[PDB]
């Protein structure tokens, strides 16, 4: 079902198919990695493992949580380079946002900006599209916690607990079934849960050092990135 | 798979299957009934290539000195045999150093090397469900 | 870019429009949408439903009102649908800059007909997969379009966009007439987009935005599920 | 294989460029001779039909005062050439009063040989031969579509090209003199040319140090046919 | 072969077939080699005619008072980067006005080469240049590529069987870095003599010459300037 | 293996390569008599046939060295009479891109012209010669590069 | 108008007037000249009230992507070097009463200074504004070495006082900024 | 089919074969590693001798970009010294609007954006290069970072490039990161490389060593090797 340079370039099939997004969504799997978002009442909880094929790696650089703004932090998935190149492209624009309106950005009309360009990304024919995938959190008024998700189809939408990836399809089962119920929600209850269903997804049960959670909240409205101290001490705090 | 839509009681018989690819076997040995279960191997992961690993290392003369955890961190993604094959080719290449106990040293380098070069051959692995 | 820019679509043998045929199934096989134009005011009830019970509905909406007095809906690929929502969103202003006074629905679907018209002979870069419908009221009398890839637009009482709107376009022929108050084209609506719907309908599951001669409104799933309780 | 046209040949080279070198082979035939007493040229004009005017042919345009050339193959190619030229000996002549020698027109139209691209149109199909008097004397010289010069003392183009370069270096010296360098070069073009010999068939192009300016006339010509 | 299209396409085993076939374009010049002692340095070149009464070709020419060129491939590039040679030449001796250091001259060289060898519909330029001059520490001859990758040596060559001419050149090239001017014109063309086949000579017209030294500023011989330097040799045997 | 139905006309055979795979899974008794595989391109395999029962060293072939073209060079050229100036060296560097089997194209070339030239013995110019003759084919002009 | 930065051991001690005002009449009873560019780097700014705001929103903007890129604190010459560079740049346009200091985590507290014409100089302390014409032979003799920030708070507050009895522009009431490793401080004074 | 000709263009599965062909053309240049030390970072590279060819001490890939930073590169050699001019002049830059030494994270960031910033693109091509980079600063410390075609950039103690790399990086395990001094590292790296690249694969080559750190004062240079001349000395006593 298809005809001419559309698998080459981005156009129509001739059902109305481009192939070169969902050879996209497959180029995040590539990574091999693992990302998870999970809500809370009054806070936000992300975590990532690594993987460290080497003993000359240093844990400081291949950290895969990045801090865009004081209060907003985010994870990327998918290929490396195109991930920075988002990451410097979302700090520019977020600093432009304080430049021209002068008040701290709502993080959500950032994942629209974010996503719009992921869609002059798509539309050129004679540029990639970019296969990197973009999940984000912060702080709003009244509006508690959020997160959202930016993909590399020039859309973004958010939700409560959200995962996409390698294995996050399951995992995306799974967490429907922890969340309702009627699951309430504390701080260490969706960490817990943040560590849970990765390792039902995978169950390594090992050391802090390979994940790295990144949290935000609101008492401390700053995002933050975990001590593997604290991370650890949530670990033995779930295995009873 | 008539003789799988009896008309008769399979109940006694058995019957295993194995392919590389579950993809042209057609619905109807994909539907139930003719076909009732579906199991599937996986890459094993570091504690089963870990045990494998183990079982692989009794029939070999060792050194002294063994740590599997070396094998471990550096072998990923192998097949249970590309790990036997990865064990039987530390041993071949130790018959150049003529030692017959020998060391996991160069179990590592042999491994390690030889194990990557698997792995550039490694081309398409990834089937269909 | 590398200045390239020629346009990719060519005349077919019989001098159709490859890419625009298929941008057009790519709308066919969008969101089930409806919209009726009757009496008061326009009546837009769209379909939004979640392929998993995580997404929240209280975040990105189907309707983003262009001005107090016109909203719009839209079938096909939302990517494509905010981009050239932000486009119009942006157009009308500068016609208010001159008149400074509110650009009449007609005159939003020429421009915002032209931009996707010049959009598909643009150079080296694939049409919409966007079948907008805009509602608005301008001089007493509400007005309900609809566009398409190609840029061309008509007028309608109501009408359907995404998959089976033939079917529910025959529907709204035989039912739906005359015109009738909000309160009936809100009913017809709803039932003419509870056909295609899932089993099960909720507030969250659709959206009605409706376009009133004191202007454009859009409605929260509170009075959503207040009208649709009792669906139909 | 549709690649580029400016890609490289595997041996190798660019292709439309050498193939511009086989676009000369069909045009019209000339000869040239450089000689201590004065550069003397000659083409074929190729006429078909008494429709075709015969001074409305020319291959021989005289650049400037003391330079003529002569053209191959594609013409309105040439016009461009020839005409941008004469703006550059005449720019030669607005800064240094002198006469642009003939070396260095050659050099300012083979650096502006090729500049053909895309981004950033297509080669030129049309030979040249440059005759002229310079502070040495007599020049005669000869250039190609991809820019590379060389000066010559008798050179030919065209489609005799190869047998006329035969029997001219057959028939050459050094201690040529002027008419005896024409006749000479006017009896290869009389074997060169299916049609009998005319007034309207050739045109010379001539130029000495003090004999000038000639550029040529017929007349003369229409004598210099009988003199054979 | 369809990978060989252009100059942006990486090849299965990644390598631009474009330069290739530019490096082969180069080949083709005939072949002249460059080399310096100690303290003075030497580059000779043989011309190609295309016929008899048609001039020989000329390859070595002058660029600024202390840095000649020789040169083969297209003469088109040829005579352009030597018209941008010239402007580098002028600019430094110019504002600075001191001489160019050869090594970051050749280093311009390479950054204005290498744009062309990446962008799409571009090429590179057949260049046979063979660089030699005199910064405060003395003789340099250097050596270009289509590839802009450039090699600082004793002496080299290009063009036909240049390699022979390397072949003469492993010998007595430890003994090139001590002997005077003359004598090693005559290990030059004793380098150049064997890219001819051995019926015809390695006459006086159909060779170039270029010297440049210490505090000797560049200069083209030809004809009866390289007429003592070819005479008083011994001919090659059968 | 190809990829989908239908059809792979060599269903059957490469059926019988996954065959030959269970002579080397389900039975063990292949651990006598081992089998050697080669092909000219690794493009196309069955991916399961990477094992020890299966294949397992596996070695690329890579272009040989001029130091090694000039020594199985020499040894198809060591039979015939060759006069005692060679260099292997200029020609070995004048090998470039070349098969090993083009250096036998070599020396059969440097054989062939040393017919027509009636030279009792091989030269270096000869092999030079036939070097020029089998690659790098043809032929254009000289010109434009002086 | 007046403006004082005095460097103590723990960091440094900005200070300046509020009144400002254009000719005879008076515009603004407070207005405060001391911008927080960043958490441990403030500026003290005279001349054109837009040109001073405009250029600190400016350094703002590119000073906090800047060091929202570095995951580091900003270092104070690096604030103050944005300031050479857009003042010299403009130095034909604009007006610069900017003087710049701030607390840093490598070097502590520092001062640099930012007159009209673009120039940039670090020193033990720094003044400027119209006010403090008068005020430099007082306090040039009356600084002492070795000061602690009580002493500097108070050494201020009678600099300014004496600058704001005196000139007719400086005027209104104090306001003085306590930056150090421990935070800013701020306040307001009489008397 | 047609996959491999864009880098523009996505492939079946999910990735570019033009950053697979330029990666692996990297990978046929000489060996050269980088290793970091406690006090500096030492860079160290294998030149080839192929005939004669030309004379010792020409186009050495070890590069010097700014005071304190410098290059050693592997792989295409004209687009390597571009990407010097590159980092040349970015280290300008920053020079110019801040006027103290980059920090080698930033400029790593910035090339790491252009080599990602021609791979998304059919008029460039895939950058044929991969280099080490290496500063040192009192108020830093011995900082390692490498770069890959791809534009993943990321940092060590020490890594390895060109052919031999698996098995060249395998036993700097036995080298200490922090433990061993610089001018000792000198001698390890010797005996490292002179040890690994058998002479049979390359009849002859030499040994060159660059090096930043404290011991020269935040200098980068090449530590001479007429200088203490350790590698002849040990490594050849080393084979055995």
Redesign the interface.
Same mark, same amino acid.
């Given at each position: 079902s298809s005809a001419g340079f559309d698998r080459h370039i981005t156009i129509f099939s001739p059902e109305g198919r481009l192939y070169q997004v969902e050879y996209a969504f497959k180029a995040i799997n590539q990574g091999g990695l693992t990302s998870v978002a999970v809500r809370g009442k009054d806070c936000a909880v992300i975590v990532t493992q690594k993987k460290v094929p080497d003993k000359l790696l240093d844990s400081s650089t291949v950290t895969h949580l990045f801090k865009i703004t004081e209060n907003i932090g985010c994870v990327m998935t998918g290929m490396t380079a195109d991930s920075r190149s988002q990451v410097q492209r979302a700090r520019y624009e977020a600093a432009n946002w304080k430049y021209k309106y002068g008040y701290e950005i709502p993080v959500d009309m950032l994942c629209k900006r974010i996503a719009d360009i992921s869609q002059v990304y798509t539309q050129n024919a004679e540029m990639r599209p970019l296969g990197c995938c973009m999940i984000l959190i912060g702080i709003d008024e009244e509006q508690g916690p959020q997160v959202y998700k930016c993909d590399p189809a020039g859309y973004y939408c958010g939700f409560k607990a959200t995962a996409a990836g390698v294995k996050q399809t399951e995992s995306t089962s799974f967490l429907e079934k922890k969340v309702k119920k009627k699951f309430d929600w504390t701080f260490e209850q969706t960490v817990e849960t943040a560590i849970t269903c990765l390792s039902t997804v995978l169950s390594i049960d090992f050391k802090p050092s390979e994940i790295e959670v990144g949290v935000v909240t609101v008492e401390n409205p700053k995002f933050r990135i975990l001590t593997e101290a604290e991370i650890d001490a949530h670990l033995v705090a779930l295995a009873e | 798979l008539n003789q799988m839509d009896g008309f008769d009681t399979l109940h006694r018989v058995k019957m295993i299957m194995a392919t590389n690819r579950p993809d042209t076997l057609d619905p109807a040995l994909l539907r139930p009934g003719r076909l009732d279960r579906k199991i599937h191997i996986d890459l094993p992961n570091e504690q089963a290539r870990l045990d494998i690993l183990k079982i692989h290392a009794g029939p070999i003369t060792k050194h002294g000195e063994i740590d599997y955890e070396a094998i471990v961190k550096l072998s990923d993604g192998f097949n249970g045999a590309d790990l036997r094959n990865v064990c039987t080719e530390a041993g071949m290449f130790a018959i150049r150093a003529d030692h017959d106990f020998v060391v996991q040293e160069d179990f590592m380098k042999a491994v390690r090397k030889v194990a990557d070069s698997k792995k550039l051959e490694s081309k398409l692995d990834y089937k269909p469900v | 870019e590398r200045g390239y820019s020629f346009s990719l679509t060519t005349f077919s043998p019989s001098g159709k429009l490859v890419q625009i045929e298929y941008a057009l199934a790519a709308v066919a096989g969008g969101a089930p949408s409806v919209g009726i134009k009757a009496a008061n005011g326009v009546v837009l009830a769209t379909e939004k439903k979640q392929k998993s019970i995580l997404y929240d509905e209280r975040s990105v909406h189907k309707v983003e009102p262009i001005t107090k007095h016109i909203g719009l809906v839209y079938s096909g690929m939302g990517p494509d649908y905010r981009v050239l929502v932000h486009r119009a969103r942006k157009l009308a202003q500068q016609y208010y800059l001159v008149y400074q006074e509110p650009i009449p629905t007609a005159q939003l679907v020429q421009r915002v007909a032209s931009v996707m018209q010049e959009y598909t002979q643009s150079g080296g870069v694939r049409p919409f997969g966007v079948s907008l419908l805009i509602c608005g009221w301008n001089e007493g009398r509400p007005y309900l379009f609809q566009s398409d890839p190609s840029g061309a637009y008509f007028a309608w009482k109501a009408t359907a966009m995404g998959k089976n709107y033939v079917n529910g376009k025959t529907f709204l022929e035989k039912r739906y007439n005359e015109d009738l108050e909000l309160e009936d084209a809100i009913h017809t609506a709803i039932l003419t987009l509870k056909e295609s719907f899932e089993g099960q309908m909720t507030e969250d599951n659709i959206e009605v935005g409706i376009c009133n001669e004191a202007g454009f409104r859009r409605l929260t799933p509170t009075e959503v599920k207040d009208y649709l309780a009792a669906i139909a | 294989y549709d690649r580029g046209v400016n890609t490289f040949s595997p041996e190798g080279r660019l292709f439309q460029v050498e193939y511009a070198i086989e676009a000369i082979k069909l045009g019209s035939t000339a000869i040239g001779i450089q000689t201590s007493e004065g550069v003397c040229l000659a083409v074929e004009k190729r006429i078909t039909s008494p429709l075709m005017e015969p001074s409305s042919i020319e291959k021989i345009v005289e650049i400037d005062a003391h330079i003529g050339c002569a053209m191959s193959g594609l013409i309105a190619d040439a016009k461009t050439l020839i005409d941008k030229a004469r703006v550059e000996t005449q720019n030669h002549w607005f800064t240094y009063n002198e006469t642009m020698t003939v070396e260095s027109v050659t050099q300012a139209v083979s650096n502006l040989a090729l500049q053909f691209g895309e981004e950033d149109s297509r080669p030129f199909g049309v030979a040249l031969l440059f005759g002229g008097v310079d502070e040495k004397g007599p020049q005669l010289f000869h250039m190609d579509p991809s820019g590379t010069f060389v000066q010559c003392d008798a050179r030919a183009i065209g489609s005799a090209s190869e047998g006329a370069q035969s029997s001219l270096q057959e028939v050459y010296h050094k201690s040529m003199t002027l008419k005896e360098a024409i006749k000479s070069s006017l009896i290869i073009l009389k074997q060169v040319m299916e049609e009998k010999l005319n007034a309207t068939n050739i045109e010379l192009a001539t130029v000495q140090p003090g004999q000038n300016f000639h550029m040529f006339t017929k007349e003369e010509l229409e004598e210099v046919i009988k003199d054979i | 072969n369809q990978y060989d299209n252009d100059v942006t396409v990486w090849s299965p085993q990644g390598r631009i077939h474009q330069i290739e076939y530019a490096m082969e374009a180069v080949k083709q010049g005939s072949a002249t080699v460059g080399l310096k002692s100690k303290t003075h340095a030497v580059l000779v070149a043989l011309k190609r005619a295309q016929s008899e009464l048609a001039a020989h070709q000329k390859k070595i020419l002058h660029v600024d008072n202390h840095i000649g060129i020789s040169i083969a491939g297209l003469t088109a590039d040829a005579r352009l980067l030597c018209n941008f040679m010239r402007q580098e030449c002028l600019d430094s001796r110019f504002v600075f006005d001191r001489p160019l250091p050869v090594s970051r001259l050749v280093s311009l060289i390479g950054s204005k080469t290498q744009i062309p060898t990446q962008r799409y519909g571009r090429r590179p330029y057949g260049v046979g240049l063979l660089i030699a001059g005199y910064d405060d520490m003395g003789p340099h001859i250097f050596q270009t590529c289509p590839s802009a990758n450039y090699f600082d040596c004793r002496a080299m060559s290009i063009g036909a069987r240049s390699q022979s001419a390397r072949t003469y050149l492993e010998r007595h090239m430890s003994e090139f870095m001590e002997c005077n001017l003359n004598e090693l014109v005559k290990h030059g063309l004793r380098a150049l003599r064997e890219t001819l086949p051995a019926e015809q000579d390695l006459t006086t017209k159909n060779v170039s010459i270029g010297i440049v030294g210490k505090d000797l500023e560049f200069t083209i011989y030809d004809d009866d300037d390289v007429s003592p330097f070819l005479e008083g040799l011994e001919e090659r045997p059968q | 293996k190809r990829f989908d139905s239908e059809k792979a006309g060599d269903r059957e055979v490469q059926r019988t390569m996954l065959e030959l795979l269970n002579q080397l899974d389900g039975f063990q008794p292949n651990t006598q008599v081992k089998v050697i595989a080669a092909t000219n391109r690794v493009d196309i395999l069955d991916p399961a046939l990477l094992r020890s029962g299966r294949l397992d060293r596996k070695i690329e072939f890579p272009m040989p060295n001029e130091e090694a073209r000039a020594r199985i060079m020499q040894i198809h050229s060591r039979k015939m009479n060759v006069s005692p100036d060679v260099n292997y060296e200029e020609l070995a560097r004048c090998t470039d891109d070349f098969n090993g089997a083009q250096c036998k194209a070599v020396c059969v070339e440097a054989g062939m012209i040393a017919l027509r030239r009636g030279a009792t013995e091989l030269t270096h110019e000869d092999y030079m010669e036939g070097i020029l003759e089998v690659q790098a084919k043809k032929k254009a002009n000289l010109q434009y590069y002086a | 108008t007046t403006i004082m930065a005095v460097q103590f051991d723990g960091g440094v001690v900005l200070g300046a007037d509020s009144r400002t005002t254009t000719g005879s009449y008076i515009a603004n009873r407070v207005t405060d000249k001391l911008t927080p560019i960043h958490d441990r780097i403030f500026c003290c700014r005279s001349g054109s009230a837009a040109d001073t705001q405009a250029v600190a929103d400016a350094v703002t903007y590119q000073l906090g992507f800047h060091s929202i890129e570095l995951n580091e604190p900003p270092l104070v010459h690096t604030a103050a070097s944005l300031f050479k560079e857009m003042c010299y740049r403009y130095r034909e346009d604009l007006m610069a009463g900017i003087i710049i200091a701030g607390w840093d985590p490598q070097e502590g507290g520092q001062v640099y200074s930012v007159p009209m014409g673009g120039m940039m100089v670090r020193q033990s302390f720094a003044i400027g504004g119209s006010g403090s014409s008068y005020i430099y032979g007082y306090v040039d003799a009356t600084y002492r070495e070795g000061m602690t920030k009580e002493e500097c708070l108070q050494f201020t507050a009678n600099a300014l006082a004496l600058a704001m009895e005196r000139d007719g522009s400086s005027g209104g009431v104090i306001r003085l900024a306590a930056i150090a490793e421990s935070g800013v401080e701020r306040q307001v004074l009489l008397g | 089919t047609? %996959?491999?000709?864009? *880098?523009? $263009?996505?492939?079946?599965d #999910?990735?570019?074969?033009?950053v697979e @062909?330029?990666?692996?053309?990297?990978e046929?240049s000489s060996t050269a590693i980088g290793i970091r030390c406690k006090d500096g970072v030492v860079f160290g590279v294998e030149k080839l001798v192929l005939?004669?060819?030309?004379?010792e001490?020409?186009?050495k890939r070890l590069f010097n970009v700014d005071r304190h930073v410098g290059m050693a590169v592997a792989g295409?050699?004209?687009?390597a010294?571009?990407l010097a001019?590159i980092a040349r002049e970015e280290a300008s830059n920053f020079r110019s609007?801040?006027? %103290?030494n980059i920090?080698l994270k930033?400029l790593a960031?910035r090339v790491?954006?252009y080599?990602?910033?021609y $791979?998304? %693109? &059919?008029?460039?091509?895939?950058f #044929?290069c991969s280099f080490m980079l290496g500063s040192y600063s009192v108020?830093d410390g011995a900082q390692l970072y490498m770069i890959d075609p791809?534009?993943? &950039? @990321? #940092? %060590?103690?020490?890594?390895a490039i060109g052919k031999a790399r698996? *098995?060249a990086? $395998?036993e700097?395990?036995k080298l200490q990161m922090k433990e061993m001094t610089c001018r000792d590292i000198v001698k390890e790296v010797a005996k490292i490389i002179y040890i690994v690249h058998d002479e049979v694969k390359d009849?002859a080559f030499e040994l060159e060593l660059s090096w930043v750190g404290e011991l020269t004062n935040g200098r980068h240079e090449i530590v001479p090797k007429d200088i203490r001349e350790e590698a002849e000395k040990y490594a050849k006593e080393s084979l055995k």
């Open positions: - | - | - | - | - | - | - | 047609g %996959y491999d000709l864009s *880098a523009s $263009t996505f492939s079946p #999910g990735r570019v074969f033009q @062909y330029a990666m692996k053309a990297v046929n005939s004669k060819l030309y004379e001490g020409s186009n295409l050699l004209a687009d010294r571009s001019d609007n801040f006027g %103290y920090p930033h960031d790491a954006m080599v990602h910033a $791979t998304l %693109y &059919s008029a460039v091509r895939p #044929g108020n791809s534009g993943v &950039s @990321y #940092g %060590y103690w020490g890594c698996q *098995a990086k $395998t700097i395990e009849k």
